[PDB]
Amino acid sequence: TTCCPSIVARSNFNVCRLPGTPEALCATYTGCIIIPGATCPGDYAN
């Protein structure tokens, strides 16, 4: 599951993913994170 720290970060995440870039690369490039669970925390609420 991915979790993002803000709106901007999620929007940029989603653009990063359009060409098929691995989630892990899009995470370091945006500040979003990948977790094994399904419940994103309150500081990664977007």
Domains annotated on the chain, with CATH? 1-46 (3.30.1350.10)
| Separation between Cα atoms, residue 42 and residue 30, nearest integer Å | 17
PDB resolution in Å = 0.5
With tokens 């803000």, the residue in question is 6
- Give the residue ranges of DSSP H helices in the chain: 7-17, 23-30
Please tell me the experimental approach by which this structure was elucidated: X-ray
Q: Rounded to 5, what percent of the chain is helix, strand, coil?
A: 40, 10, 50
The answer to whether the beta carbons of residues 32 and 9 sit under 8 Å apart is: yes
Beta bridge partners of 33: 3
| Separation between Cα atoms, residue 26 and residue 42, nearest integer Å | 20
User: Could you give phi then psi for residue 4, rounded to 5 degrees?
Assistant: -125, 150
The length of the chain, given as a count of residues: 46
DSSP secondary structure code for residue 2 in this structure: E
